[PDB]
Amino acid sequence: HIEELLRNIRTQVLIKLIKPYTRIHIPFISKELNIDVADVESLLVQCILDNTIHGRIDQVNQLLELDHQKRGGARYTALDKWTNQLNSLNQAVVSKLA
Amino acid sequence: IIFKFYESKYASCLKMLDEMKDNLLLDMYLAPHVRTLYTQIRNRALIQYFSPYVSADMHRMAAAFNTTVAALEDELTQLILEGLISARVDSHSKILYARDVDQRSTTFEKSLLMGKEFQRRAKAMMLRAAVLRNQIHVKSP
Amino acid sequence: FSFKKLLDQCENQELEAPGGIATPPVYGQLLALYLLHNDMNNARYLWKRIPPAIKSANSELGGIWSVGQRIWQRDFPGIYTTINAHQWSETVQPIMEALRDATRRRAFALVSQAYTSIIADDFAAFVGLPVEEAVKGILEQGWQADSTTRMVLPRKPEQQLARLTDYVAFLEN
Amino acid sequence: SIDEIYKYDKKQQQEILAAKPWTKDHHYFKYCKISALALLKMVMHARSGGNLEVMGLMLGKVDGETMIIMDSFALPVEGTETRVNAQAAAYEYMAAYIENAKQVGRLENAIGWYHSHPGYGCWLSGIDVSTQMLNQQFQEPFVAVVIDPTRTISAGKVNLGAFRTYPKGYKPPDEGPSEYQTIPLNKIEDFGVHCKQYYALEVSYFKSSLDRKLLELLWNKYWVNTLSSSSLLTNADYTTGQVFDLSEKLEQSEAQLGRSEDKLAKATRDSCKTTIEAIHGLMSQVIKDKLFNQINI
Amino acid sequence: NLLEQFILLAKGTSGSALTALISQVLEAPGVYVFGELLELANVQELAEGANAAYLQLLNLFAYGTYPDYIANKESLPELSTAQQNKLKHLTIVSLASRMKCIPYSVLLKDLEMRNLRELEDLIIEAVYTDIIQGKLDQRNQLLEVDFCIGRDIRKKDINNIVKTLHEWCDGCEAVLLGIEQQVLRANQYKENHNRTQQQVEAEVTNIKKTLKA
Amino acid sequence: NGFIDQIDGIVHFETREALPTWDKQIQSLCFQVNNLLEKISQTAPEWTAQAMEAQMAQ
Amino acid sequence: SVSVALHPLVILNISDHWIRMRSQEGRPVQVIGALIGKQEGRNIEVMNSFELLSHTVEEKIIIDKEYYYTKEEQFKQVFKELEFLGWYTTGGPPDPSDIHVHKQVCEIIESPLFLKLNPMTKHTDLPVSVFESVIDIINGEATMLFAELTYTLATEEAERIGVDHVARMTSTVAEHLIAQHSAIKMLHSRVKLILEYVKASEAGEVPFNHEILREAYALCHCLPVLSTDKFKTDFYDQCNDVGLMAYLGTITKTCNTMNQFVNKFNVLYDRQ
Ligand SMILES: [Zn+2]
């Protein structure tokens, strides 16, 4: 149980650490948590997979880019649905003149 | 195998999966599906490996799947061609970048295309109405 | 400008003026002026419909359909070489004086976004200048060359309120 | 003589209430006069309620066949449009507020109740109809007021309605003009079932003599807020719900085309209204650009 | 209220005392406009004499900018500590009057500064005096101005005010005319469409009636 | 309110979106117009009355 | 000091209170009320108001504290984030009776606002005036005085639409364009007056005032309003979005007309 115990502290520390940032350095996280880079990258992968950290890693630059911006995603979806429905209604109307 | 697939350890999960391949081919209810399952498992690993990453290195990606960059490029091309991975291969530094679709541009493009098709169909229907009204057809004679 | 008016004039004099076949002057003028506007689709048919008697009598027209193939199978050195091969009277001289400028501008516009790093030797053949003269004149536009390897890096260079009311009046009928 | 309406005659009101003309004819009340302050307070409360339904009670009297409304106070209740007779949940508040008002010159009695319909038009649903029947049975005279703040902002016009229901077992004669109103799909059934049991009054607004002077003096610093306000950015979330509802209406329209009466015309009427509002939102911005961003050297 | 206090204090003073009052006015904080002091007869009388330097200084502080104290530095008297800061603040105001997004390079060049920190501190202390209001963007190196005070004017600049107000009046009138025209056209369109619809309906009704034969 | 970018190193405060800023500047310009008119009407009432009664009754 | 953002609902409340009190007594009287709103730092925003009961004994008027506490308990149920700010009344300039009542009000809240509305005014501006209490020591006693504050009318689309509808009292594009034709006509008739004054000062008709001619210069320099490069990308984004929405609307209407014509056609020219 020691590895189970000394892994749920690092998770909460890391979750709190990434709150104010939008782009963070992996070697910077490797200093707060007394772990190497290879361990913090694996911890980030496991956290990102289980819907706990909303971000994505950058391997070639050793980064962590967090998702913070939310553009209008409801207007364009509505416009897509409207376009796709008109594309079928038009065919249904035209086919009546057989 | 299950516990190392779950923990994102594909370097040895696939090797242990391949160690018992010529032991399930002798099974009577599982042999014909060994080809289908083993291909389905690997494709599920490749998508899982490239999921927390926005810019992955293809050398370490190929070294974790017990394959080469040349064959991994073909595998990734096949996966990207269908809607499984939204990624683009950079075959200069061998880097798999994650792409993001622009919702606004896609919406505008598809709406303009729908409008063009609707106008074409409208013109065709008007011509059809004219020919039907005039009763134009070719007689069997 | 003025070449489009000449083009439509030769078109009209080809259609209604003659008794089926027009004079070799206007025929060759139209053939050469189609190439200037980059209308190879029409020029091919113009050459295909020419009777096989003007071709064998006025051979100069056969010369003009020697530049055209070079535009057809895109070959800039071929264009520049073939233009400077033949000569005619004062009917195509200003045609192949604007064709030169059009082709040299087409080459410049072609290698301005298709290429991001091109050998100077190939650029000279593209534009149609000697290499030494090409590189020196490049630097004015801001394209940064790179000597000792000859790798020039081309560098990229009132009623709305009425319309909205018209749309509203239509939607609400 | 404009302020003459503001005078409260207790004896005349008592005589009119005792007579009860309305119990002999079910079509008695035909006019509804609303004060300026009452309308402003109702609109402000409905807007502050957010996307939820807020309700309140309104004070006034009756004069002839006209229902006069002078003030309205909000109630601390939540969950309207789903519970019958929701106002009783704060009945003690009704005692506390009104008994306070009588101390400060507010003598008019309770006359009606109002609630908001954010984004789905003004009408009476089944629960509202039942509550109005109860109120008319136990608190006659009474009137139901329904307000739409989101559509008031979107369309640029006050969307208000005053309705009174018909007694149980009464058959209403003809009266089928049915002025069109855009109703969402998820609530299209409630409008259909309860459509003949209530009739709408003719709504008019009145203001005192001092209100007119203060309002004409107020239109000297308030013209700024007209051409310095953006309508597209305000109701941006309304014309996404509207487009979703329109796209879902087109589903039923096409399904019927493949075969609840001529749904394509109604879907077109909704699409036209939404697009007209959108274009109205851009015409004002074009005008603002022509006035302010085109005066350079 | 400071400038009128100094003007009242300078009702009759002339000569050395007037020059001292001019210097005190130029140094006093909160006085960023000197136009009523310039209109005084005795202040303008300093041109004929040995005190024309102070009149030149006052003109520079009323209509000039800091670079102008780069070519007349030799002729003008020595400038104090707060006087240079006031002139720099007025230069910032003059720059912001033309453009509403002042690059850092322009401010560094005209204000004669070497560091970004010194320039930003000067801009911040200018903002604290409420002569300009704005925000500093450092990624793009811009100063975005939302409001600035109006400096002094000559008698030859009012023509510009008339010129740029005539354009605004004409634009408002032309917008009003277009709005009225659009209203008229829309009403005409609606009336014509319903007249056509009612005529088609009348024709159909007449056809129905005559069909009963 | 803001966020930290650690790559180059910059803390971002509020960004003042363009269109609401445009509306605020329109409000401020109209406020200046109103204040200037009040000042004109206050420092010269006799001329201001004649000027008002030259376009309202025109 | 602080900045005040008044709401027209407060003014309507005061006017209705005064009209009600006058109509029920046959003689104008002075009314007292209470203001509720939100304060964020140094930005006070008066939102709503209610009445208060006052008792006038001998020559001094007092505010009943228990009634105010009852009303606070009542209104905290409905509006939770709104808080007491000050009081209002009707009259001319501030009076010793007002400064006496302000002490009783200040006994409840440290810094209460004072609002005075003149129901019988003679100027051409809104008669609402806002004051705040400033205490001072003089001649060996403490005197409390009133300092005037400048207020601005608050912004809300629902409130603006309601106010416009109440003020006015009587094609859909010919009714929206008139609401924007009555606000430009007010800006134009002010810019024209400023231009006339500037030309009069130039040619010479009124004394040369430097302050006015400096503020006019600043006003002229304020144009154009925000012509940055980022603006003419958001503006065009909005224009193109509305254009696409309009395009889809016309496609839908054309589909409806399509269906109507096809239905009308498959009646006459039907041979099956
Ligand atoms: Zn309801």
Swiss-Prot record, chain B:
Organism encoding this protein: Homo sapiens (Human)
Domain description: The PCI domain is necessary and sufficient for the interactions with other CSN subunits of the complex. Mediates the interaction with CAPN8.
Phosphoserine found at: 140
Subunit structure, interactors included: Component of the CSN complex, composed of COPS1/GPS1, COPS2, COPS3, COPS4, COPS5, COPS6, COPS7 (COPS7A or COPS7B), COPS8 and COPS9 isoform 1. In the complex, it probably interacts directly with COPS2, COPS3, COPS4 and COPS5. Interacts directly with inositol kinase ITPK1. Interacts with CAPN8. Interacts with USP48. Interacts with ASB4; this interaction negatively regulates GPS1.
Gene (name only): GPS1
Name of the protein in question: COP9 signalosome complex subunit 1
Tissues expressed in: Widely expressed.
Function according to Swiss-Prot or TrEMBL: Essential component of the COP9 signalosome complex (CSN), a complex involved in various cellular and developmental processes. The CSN complex is an essential regulator of the ubiquitin (Ubl) conjugation pathway by mediating the deneddylation of the cullin subunits of SCF-type E3 ligase complexes, leading to decrease the Ubl ligase activity of SCF-type complexes such as SCF, CSA or DDB2. The complex is also involved in phosphorylation of p53/TP53, c-jun/JUN, IkappaBalpha/NFKBIA, ITPK1 and IRF8/ICSBP, possibly via its association with CK2 and PKD kinases.
Covered range of the whole protein: 329 to 469 of 491
Compartment list: Cytoplasm; Nucleus
PCI domain location: 1-103
Family: Belongs to the CSN1 family.
Disulfide bonds: none
From Swiss-Prot, chain C:
Keyword terms, alphabetized: Cytoplasm, Nucleus, Phosphoprotein, Signalosome
Pfam families in the cross-refs: CSN8_PSD8_EIF3K
Chief location bin: cytoplasm
Compartments, record wording: Cytoplasm; Nucleus
Domain PCI: start-end pairs: 1-157
GO cellular component, one term: cytosol
Gene Ontology biological-process annotations: activation of NF-kappaB-inducing kinase activity; COP9 signalosome assembly; negative regulation of cell population proliferation; protein deneddylation; protein neddylation; protein phosphorylation; regulation of protein neddylation
Family label: Belongs to the CSN8 family.
Subunit: Component of the CSN complex, composed of COPS1/GPS1, COPS2, COPS3, COPS4, COPS5, COPS6, COPS7 (COPS7A or COPS7B), COPS8 and COPS9 isoform 1. In the complex, it probably interacts directly with COPS3, COPS4 and COPS7 (COPS7A or COPS7B).
Reported function: Component of the COP9 signalosome complex (CSN), a complex involved in various cellular and developmental processes. The CSN complex is an essential regulator of the ubiquitin (Ubl) conjugation pathway by mediating the deneddylation of the cullin subunits of SCF-type E3 ligase complexes, leading to decrease the Ubl ligase activity of SCF-type complexes such as SCF, CSA or DDB2. The complex is also involved in phosphorylation of p53/TP53, c-jun/JUN, IkappaBalpha/NFKBIA, ITPK1 and IRF8/ICSBP, possibly via its association with CK2 and PKD kinases.
Protein name: COP9 signalosome complex subunit 8
Organism: Homo sapiens (Human)
Gene: COPS8
From Swiss-Prot, chain D:
Subcellular location: Cytoplasm, Cytosol; Nucleus; Cytoplasm, Perinuclear region; Cytoplasmic vesicle, Secretory vesicle, Synaptic vesicle
Effect of residue 115 to Q: Abolishes ability to deneddylate cullins, without affecting the 'Lys-63'-specific deubiquitination associated with the COP9 signalosome complex
Keywords for this protein: Acetylation, Cytoplasm, Cytoplasmic vesicle, Hydrolase, Metal-binding, Metalloprotease, Nucleus, Protease, Signalosome, Synapse, Zinc
Keyword Ion transport attached: no
Cofactor(s) required for function per UniProt: a divalent metal cation
EC number: 3.4.-.-
Gene3D superfamilies tied to this protein: Cytidine Deaminase, domain 2 (3.40.140.10)
Entry's Gene Ontology molecular function annotations: deNEDDylase activity; enzyme binding; macrophage migration inhibitory factor binding; metal ion binding; metal-dependent deubiquitinase activity; metallopeptidase activity; transcription coactivator activity; translation initiation factor activity
UniProt domain comment: The JAMM motif is essential for the protease activity of the CSN complex resulting in deneddylation of cullins. It constitutes the catalytic center of the complex.
Descriptive protein name: COP9 signalosome complex subunit 5
Higher taxonomy: Eukaryota, Metazoa, Chordata, Craniata, Vertebrata
Curated annotation (Swiss-Prot), chain E:
Domain of life: Eukaryota
Primary localization class, coarse: cytoplasm
Cellular compartment(s): Cytoplasm; Nucleus
Start and end residues of each PCI domain: 1-150
Ranges in coiled-coil conformation: 179-213
GO CC annotations, alphabetized: COP9 signalosome; cytoplasm; cytosol; nucleoplasm; nucleus
One GO-annotated biological process of the protein: protein deneddylation
Keywords per UniProt: Acetylation, Coiled coil, Cytoplasm, Host-virus interaction, Nucleus, Phosphoprotein, Signalosome
Subunit structure, interactors included: Component of the CSN complex, composed of COPS1/GPS1, COPS2, COPS3, COPS4, COPS5, COPS6, COPS7 (COPS7A or COPS7B), COPS8 and COPS9 isoform 1. In the complex, it probably interacts directly with COPS1, COPS2, COPS4, COPS5, COPS6 and COPS8. Interacts with EIF3S6.
Family designation: Belongs to the CSN7/EIF3M family. CSN7 subfamily.
Function comment: Component of the COP9 signalosome complex (CSN), a complex involved in various cellular and developmental processes. The CSN complex is an essential regulator of the ubiquitin (Ubl) conjugation pathway by mediating the deneddylation of the cullin subunits of SCF-type E3 ligase complexes, leading to decrease the Ubl ligase activity of SCF-type complexes such as SCF, CSA or DDB2. The complex is also involved in phosphorylation of p53/TP53, JUN, I-kappa-B-alpha/NFKBIA, ITPK1 and IRF8/ICSBP, possibly via its association with CK2 and PKD kinases.
Record protein name field: COP9 signalosome complex subunit 7b
Organism field: Homo sapiens (Human)
Full-sequence portion shown in this chain: 10 to 222 of 264
